[PDB]
C-alpha cells in the first residue's frame, strides 16, 4: 500500500521553522541558534524526548557524528569556528555551490537519454511546423516573421535547457529529493536499516535522512539543515528558475527579461542572506512595484509616479527597519532593485510578476502569524451611522431593482415606514424602477423599509455543497491535540492531566457517515442560537502554504456543525440574493466575464474613424477587508437578508460567535510558550492566541460583504453624480469612472478631465469606506487611466497582459496527484504549453517545447523509477532504444502515445473530434519523417482492447485501446466508490447500488446495439438518465489525497489490483511496445489507407476496426468533425497579392481584415476603431409550454425524450421507448411528456480559473464577415474557423511586433476540402433489444421528483 | 307700533354683530389647517428618529437579535 | 305673541354672547399651540442633526483580558424590529 | 305692511348664512378631533422612545 | 305671520344644538396642556443627549 501513498513530490504544506528547530535540537546537531530563535523549544526537556523516538534520535546522532568526523571544526562552540550554520533563507546565495556532480550518475544518464531522443525528431518537427505554416497561410514564414534572429528547434531547446545555469542545481536537488523520498518510503515500511545516505562529494558533503538533510559546502564553509518540506520547496523553486531562465533564453519575446530576472535573483539572494526571513517583505514590495512601474507611464501628471514613490518609500522602510543597511546602502539597494523594471514594455513589466515564487517561501511561526491578525482584528473601530444607513438604503434600492427586471417586474413584499413620502408611496404602489438619484434623497425613508420573504429558498436546494470536504477543527477540549505529543507530554505530566486525543476526522466523512442528516434541522444550530451557547465549538487557524505576504498566511477551520451552517448560509446567499445584484459584472460564465472586462477596459479607447466617453480606472484589493468587518456595520443588511429569506437569525453568526470564543493557531511544532496554559478560554491575547476576535475570517460570509461593498460603491457613485461599473471580486474590485468629454480634446486632456471627474467619486468612496470601518491606504488604491487589475490579470488599454513566465514557472517534472503516471505528467505539461500558447509565447516554440518536455518527462520516469520492479525488461528495452522513446512521445494520446497537445490545439481551444486531430497529426508526422507509415498500419491493425458498451457510451471519440485511462483517475473513482458504499446519509439513500455497473452496461448496450450506432446520442441519454444522475452524484465527491488514503485504508485493494496500480506505467509501456517497435503484419485491405487519405475516413475506419468486437462490422456515425488545420486552406494577402484559391475555383472563405497604421499603446485616434473581439459563442428552445421553475429532473427528462425522438425516430414505438427512459427521472405520463417535450429537431448534443484564450492585442482591430459562406455542428465548425483565423492573425503579428504598416487579409478557404461532408440523421433506429430493468431511486429527491408540475 | 319696529331693528343689528363674531371665529381655522400640515411632518420626523434609535440599538454586538419570521 | 317674540330672543342672544366670549379664547390657545409646535420643529431639526452624524465604535479587546471574563454577552436570540414591524 | 315681509326675508337670508358658516365651523371642530387623535399617537410613540433611550 | 315665528323657533333650536357641540369643542384644552407637557419632557430629555 505504501507504494501508492508515496511522499509528495511538490510543496503543499507551509514551511515550519520550529519543525526544523525540533529536528536540529533532537539530535544535538551543531548550530548557532540563539535562545530567542528556539522560542518555546529551548525550555523543553529534551532528555525525555530523546528517550522516546529512539530511532529518530539514533539517526540524528548518526548524522551528527558523521558531520563531526568529516569536519573536525564543528566540535568548536561559541561560533569560534570558521563554519557558519545557516537556516534556509540565508542559504539562497550558496545554492549553486552544492553540486554533487561526482558520485552521481542518474541525472547524467537522464540528460544523455533526453538529448539522444530529442536529436532524432528535431528536423521532423521543423518540417511539421513548416508544412503547417504553408498550409495555413501559403507562405513559409508564419511562425518566424516576428523572430526574423534565431529559431530554436527541439534540439536547441534541449541544449539550452540542459546547459544553462541552474541546470546542475536542478539535477543535484532532483537527486537529493529522489534519495530522500526513497528513504522516507523505506522508513514507512519499517526497514530501519541503512536509513542514512552520505554522498561525500568533494567540497560538498550531503547527508540524507528521512527527517532532514545536512548540506555542507567547503567553498563557502556554510552548513545548513533542510527538512522534507524545505527540500521540496527548494527543488520546486530551482525548477521554476530553470524553466523561467530557459524560456527567456529561448523565446525572442522574453529575451529582454533574462538578464533582468537574473540580476534580480542575485540581488534578492544577497538580500536574503543579509536579512533573514524579512526579505519576503521586499519580495511583496516588488510584486506591488510591478504595478507601480505600470502606473509610471500614465498620461495624467497627477497620477503618474505616486504608486512608484510610495512603493519606493515602503521598500526603504523595510530595508532600514532593523538597521541592517544605513540610508545610503538602502538607497543603493532600492536603485538596483528598481533599475530592473525600467525601459520595459507593459507586457514584460507584467511578466516580472513570475518572480514571486522564485525565492521560495519564508519559514513560518505561529506566534508571528497570529500577531498580524491580532493587530488588525480585536481592535477598536469608530463607525459612521449616517454612512451605514445610506449604504443600507442603497442596498435596499439595489435589492428592489434586482428583484424587478425579473418576477414580471413586481416589487418584493415590503413594509413602508411611517416617514415615507408620497413619492415612495406611489412608487411602491406603481412598482416602478427606483432611480438611484431618487434613492440618494429621502435615504431615511429608503432605509427602515423591510423586504419580507422573497424566496422559498431551501438549504438542501444544492447537493454539491455538502459533498466538498472542508477542514474541521477539534472540539474545545481536544484543542491541544494538534501539537506534537513529545512537546506537550511534559506539560501534561506537570499539570497531572490526561493527554488530549489527536483529531483526524473530516467533514466529508462525517457527512457521509451521518445516519440522520437534514439541512432543515442543521440550520437550527445557528437559527436557534445554539451556536452561541455551544461549549464544544472551537475555531482555529493553520499556516497557509506557498504564501509570502504577511496577510493571508493563515486559514481558519471550524467545527463540523458550524462549518455545515457556514456552507449552507453561503449557498443560500449565492443562489437567490447574489443573483439580484447585476451592478457588478460577475457571472458563472468565464466567456461573458472576459467580454465584460474587455468592454470595460475598451470604454476609454475611441478612434477618429460631439462629446466622447472617458474612463478612469480604480482598483483596490479587499484582502484585509475581512478582518475589518464589524458587527454594527453588517447588522442591518443581515437583518434585512434574514427577513427576505424568512429565517429569523441566520446571518451575523460569524461576529457573534467570534466575540465569545478564543481563537488559536494550530501548528504541530508550535505549542504555546507558557506550559501552564492548558485551556483555551483563559488564554491571554499573546503568543498563538487571539482572545475575543471582533472581525471576520477570509472566505467566510463573503457574499454578504461583497453585496455591502457593492452598495457602498453605488452610493459613492451616485453621491458624486458619476457613472461607474463596479466589478467587485471579493478579494479585489475594479471601478471605471465614466464621464463625457469633448471630442476635439487631446487624449491627454480627456484623460485629465476624466481623472478630475473621478476625484470626487474617489473622495466619496474613501469617506464611505472609512465610515463603514474600512480605511483605504495607498497600498490598496491604484489609480490608473489605462489599466485595472482583475483576477491577478492586468487589463492594459483594452488588452490582457501575457504573464506567460508565471505559467512556465510551474512546469515541473511530476504531477503532485496520486497516480504519478507518465500520462498524467504529460497531460499537465501539455496543459501548461497550451497556457503558454495563449499567453503570447511563439506557437512554434510552444510546439517544440511540448515535444521536448514530453520526451524529458518520459526519460525521467524511465531513469528515475518510482517503484522498484523485479523485471526491468521493459525499462531496459526503452532505455537502450531512444527511437522507441521518440515514437511513443510523438504519438497522440488518443492512439496510446504521450502527445497530449494536438497541432490544431495551438490555435483554437475548442476541438470537435480528438481522433480526427490525432490522425491529422500522425499524417503530418509521417509526411515530415518523425514517424513511419507502418506505425499507422500497426495502429489500424491493433487488436481491440477489453472494452464494453459502457466505456464507448460514457466517453465517445475514444478507441478500444487499453491503458488510455491513467491509474490516477482509477484511484479517484475507487475513492468515490468506497465513499458511496459506506455512505449512510439520508440525502443519498438510493444513489448507490451494487449493480450500478451492470445497469450502465445494459443501458449503453440498449442505446448502442442498434442498426446505426450513435455514441453521442447514447452518451447524452445515459447522462440524462437516472444512472447518469447517480454517476454524477458519485462524481460530486472531491477525492482528495486524504480521501484517497482513507478509501485505501478502510477498503483495501486486492493484491492483483495493488500490483496493477503500482505497475501501471510498466504495463502501459509494454502494451505500447507492441506498436512502437516493429512493423506488424496487418490485413491487406488496410493498405488502401494512405498518408493522403482524409483524416475523417481514416478515423471512421479506425473506429470500425477498433470496436469490431462490440459492433461486428457496424459503422459509427455522428462523431467525425473536420480537423481545423486540415479543414481550411488559407491564404494571406499582403498589399498587391491575391488569393490563389479565390482565383482558382474555390469561392468559400471566412473574411478576416486587419487595417493598416495600427500601433498598440499609442494615441486612440490614430489606430482604427477598437471593439471586443470574437472570444467564442456558448449555448444560446421554443418549447410548446414554457415551464418556469422546472426542476433539474424535469429538464433532464425533457432533454432525454427530445434527443431520443430526434435520433432514433418519431414513431410511436420510439415514443414508448423514450417514455420509460424519461419516467426513470420524472412521474409524467405519455401525454404530458409529449406535450412538454421541447422541439425535437437540431439536437445540440452538448455534454461533458480565469484563463483568457489570448491577449486580444491585434484581434480587437480585426474585421470579420462570413457572408460568402453557408452560415448545430456547422455553427461549431464556423466558430472554430473564426477562432483559428483570429489566432492566425494574432500569431502573424506576435507580441514582439506592435505595429502593422500594411493591411492584411486572411481568407481561410474552407471549400475544396475532403473533410466537408453532408450531415444526415433522424433515421429510424428500432431498439433491437428489450429495455433493461432499471432500478430508480423513487424516494430520492435529487434524482426523482414525483411531482414535476405545479 | 313703531316700537316693535325699533325692537326688530335692534335684533337684526345685534345678530349682525354676532355674525361678525362668528365669521372671525371661522377665519381662525386657517392656522389650525397649517398646524395639521406641520403635525404631518411632526409624525414623519418622529418616526424617522425612532427608527434611527432602534437601528442604533440593534447594532450592539452584545445581544444577538433576529428579524421576526 | 310679540312679548314672546322678544323675551326668549333676547335671552338666547345673551347666551350666544357668553358662548362667543368663551369661543374667542380658541384663537388664542390655537395660536399659542401653533408657535409652541414651531419650537418643536426647531428642536426636532437639531435632534435629527445630532443623531444623523453619530459615531458607533466597538471597543475591541486591546487589553488582553481573558475571554472568560469578557463573557458578558447574552446567548439568547431576541427578536426586535426597527422600522418595519 | 310689506316691509315686514321684506325684512323677514332678509332675516331668513342672514339665517341661512349662519347655518353655512356654523356648519363649516363644526367641520373645523371635527378636524381638530382628528388632530387630537394623531397627537395622541405622537405622545404614545414619544413615550416609547423615552423608554428606549434610557 | 305665525309661520315665521315657528320657523324661528326651529332655527333657535338648531342654534341651541350648535352651542351644545360648541361646548364640546373646548374639551381639547386638557390635551393641549398634555402636548405642552410633552414639549417639556422632550426638551428635558434632549438635554441629556448632548
Ligand atoms: Zn481567397
Ligand atoms: Zn480532408
Residue numbers in the entry:
A (entry chain A): 4 to 151, 158 to 618, 658 to 1228, 1232 to 1299, 1308 to 1330, 1337 to 1415
B (entry chain B): 218 to 286
C (entry chain C): 220 to 304
D (entry chain E): 218 to 271
E (entry chain D): 218 to 267
Question: Would you copy out the relevant sentences from the publication that reported this structure?
Answer:
L and P function as the RNA polymerase complex, responsible for replicating and transcribing the viral genome. To catalyze the RNA synthesis in both replication and transcription, L sequentially consists of five domains: the RNA-dependent RNA polymerase domain (RdRp), polyribonucleotidyl transferase domain (PRNTase), connector domain (CD), methyltransferase domain (MTase), and C-terminal domain (CTD). P harbors an oligomerization domain (POD) for self-oligomerization, and the oligomeric P attaches to RdRp of L, tethering the polymerase to NC to extract the RNA strand for both replication and transcription. Here, we resolved two L–P complex conformations from the mumps virus (MuV), a typical member of nsNSVs, via cryogenic-electron microscopy.
The other conformation has CD-MTase-CTD averaged out due to the structural flexibility, with its RNA tunnel inaccessible to MTase, unfavorable for genome transcription. Following the same strategy, Lbody–P was determined at the resolution of 3.01 Å, and only RdRp and PRNTase are visible in L. The missing of appendage in Lbody–P indicates the structural flexibility in MuV L–P, as in other nsNSVs. MuV Lbody–P owns a flexible appendage, and its RNA tunnel is inaccessible to MTase-CTD, which is unfavorable for transcription. However, the RNA cavity formed by RdRp and PRNTase domains is available, with the potential capability for genome replication. MuV Lbody–P takes an appendage-free conformation but still owns an exposed RNA cavity formed by RdRp and PRNTase domains with the potential to another replication state for RNA synthesis. Models in (c, e) are the composite atomic models of MuV Lintegral–P and Lbody–P via rigid body docking of individual models into their respective composite cryo-EM maps, which are B-factor sharpened. In both conformations, parallel P tetramers are revealed around MuV L, which, together with structures of other nsNSVs, demonstrates the diverse origins of the L-binding X domain of P. Our study links varying structures of nsNSV polymerase complexes with genome replication and transcription and points to a sliding model for polymerase complexes to advance along the RNA templates.
